[PDB]
Amino acid sequence: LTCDQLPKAAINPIQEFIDSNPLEFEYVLTETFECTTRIYVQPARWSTTKAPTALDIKGTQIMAYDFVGGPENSAHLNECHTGDKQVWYFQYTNLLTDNGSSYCAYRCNGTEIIEYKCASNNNGTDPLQHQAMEVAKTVPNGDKIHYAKSNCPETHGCFAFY
Amino acid sequence: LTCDQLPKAAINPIQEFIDSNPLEFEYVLTETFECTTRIYVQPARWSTTKAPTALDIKGTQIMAYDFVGGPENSAHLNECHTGDKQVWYFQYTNLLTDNGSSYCAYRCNGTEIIEYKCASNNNGTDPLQHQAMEVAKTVPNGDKIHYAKSNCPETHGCFAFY
Ligand SMILES: *[C@@H]1O[C@H](CO[C@@H]2O[C@@H](C)[C@@H](O)[C@@H](O)[C@@H]2O)[C@@H](O)[C@H](O)[C@H]1NC(C)=O
Ligand SMILES: *[C@@H]1O[C@H](CO[C@@H]2O[C@@H](C)[C@@H](O)[C@@H](O)[C@@H]2O)[C@@H](O)[C@H](O)[C@H]1NC(C)=O
Numbered sequence: 345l346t347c348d349q350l351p352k353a354a355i356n357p358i359q360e361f362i363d364s365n366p367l368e369f370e371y372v373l374t375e376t377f378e379c380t381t382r383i384y385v386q387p388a389r390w391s392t393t394k395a396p397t398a399l400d401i402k403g404t405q406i407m408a409y410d411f412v413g414g415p416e417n418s419a420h421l422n423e424c425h426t427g428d429k430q431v432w433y434f435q436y437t438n439l440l441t442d443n444g445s446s447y448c449a450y451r452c453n454g455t456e457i458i459e460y461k462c463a464s465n466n467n468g469t470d471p472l473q474h475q476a477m478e479v480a481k482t483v484p485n486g487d488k489i490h491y492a493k494s495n496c497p498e499t500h501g502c503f504a505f506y
Numbered sequence: 507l508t509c510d511q512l513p514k515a516a517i518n519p520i521q522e523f524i525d526s527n528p529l530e531f532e533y534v535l536t537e538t539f540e541c542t543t544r545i546y547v548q549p550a551r552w553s554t555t556k557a558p559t560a561l562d563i564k565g566t567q568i569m570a571y572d573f574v575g576g577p578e579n580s581a582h583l584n585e586c587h588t589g590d591k592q593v594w595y596f597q598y599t600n601l602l603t604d605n606g607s608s609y610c611a612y613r614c615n616g617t618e619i620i621e622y623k624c625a626s627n628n629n630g631t632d633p634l635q636h637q638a639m640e641v642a643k644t645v646p647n648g649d650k651i652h653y654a655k656s657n658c659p660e661t662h663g664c665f666a667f668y
Pocket of ligand 1: 467468491552
């Protein structure tokens with residue numbers, strides 16, 4: 345299996361992602377998105393693109409990306425500080441169940457995987473999530489995929505932020 | 507007029523604030539919340555307090571505060587990185603109108619004002635907002651209140667983030 349052959353699942357309407365806030369990453373590829381909370385935001389009233397925004401929050405640092413849909417169930421992200429463009433797909437989504445929400449998303453460079461983000465608001469208890477992670481690890485460079493919460497900073501009274 | 511005598515307006519249900527996302531500050535007291543976007547987040551499914559969270563995002567930096575209601579229409583904030591406690595009130599709110607949402611909130615130390623946050627998603631065009639700002643400037647230390655967006659960094663393709 346190569347990264348280009350992973351499923352490209354249907355993307356839920358944006359409101360279903362917003363209604364899942366806040367999410368934390370369970371499995372990630374690089375160190376970048378360890379100990380990170382994901383927040384979805386609807387478009388600003390003054391936005392001329394009317395693109396929603398994804399926020400990746402790691403302690404007191406934040407990456408933001410406006411995003412729009414592209415071909416074949418892609419998400420086209422524009423990182424708000426750098427202008428860097430990224431193309432993402434979803435392996436699966438399972439939002440707004442009786443046990444909460446989960447999904448796994450990935451970023452390829454051709455046949456190899458270069459980033460991976462499995463998110464949930466149920467501490468990774470959706471059986472689909474571990475299953476998806478086990479599939480993604482089989483594509484080239486998927487060996488890097490690992491648990492995102494092994495060594496996070498101590499909290500100071502909150503639950504999705506530190 | 508002193509800070510303790512400012513109105514303590516009724517606080518809208520949390521969903522009305524979330525539905526107003528994203529907001530930007532129009533008038534602020536210190537430099538801290540210049541060029542800042544405010545995002546409201548519902549409580550995490552795993553939160554034992556079930557407190558919602560306010561995010562103050564300034565470029566790639568973020569302050570987060572879980573908050574709960576207190577006496578006399580107060581909001582009791584817990585800054586998520588430091589554990590520092592803050593007590594806020596609203597001068598007024600005007601959410602989810604045909605021209606969007608605005609509010610002005612303030613933090614006193616007795617008779618003086620120590621922080622001020624007027625937010626909107628309509629670029630400060632609610633007449634109530636300039637009116638409220640003019641009242642707040644009349645309390646001790648209110649002279650510091652000023653426009654929050656005079657010199658913000660250039661964007662890189664987004665609208666509420668940079
Ligand atoms: C969240 O789950 C944690 C255990 O997760 C499991 O073990 C870690 C090391 C990973 O391999 C992960 O994929 C496994 O599912 C608990 O330590 C923690 O207490 C849980 N949090 C709760 C219940 O709030
Ligand atoms: C947003 O409004 C800006 C003008 O705002 C006015 O002037 C500044 C200096 C402050 O005094 C403020 O309180 C006033 O309301 C415009 O420069 C800007 O283009 C507007 N943005 C829009 C239309 O998207």
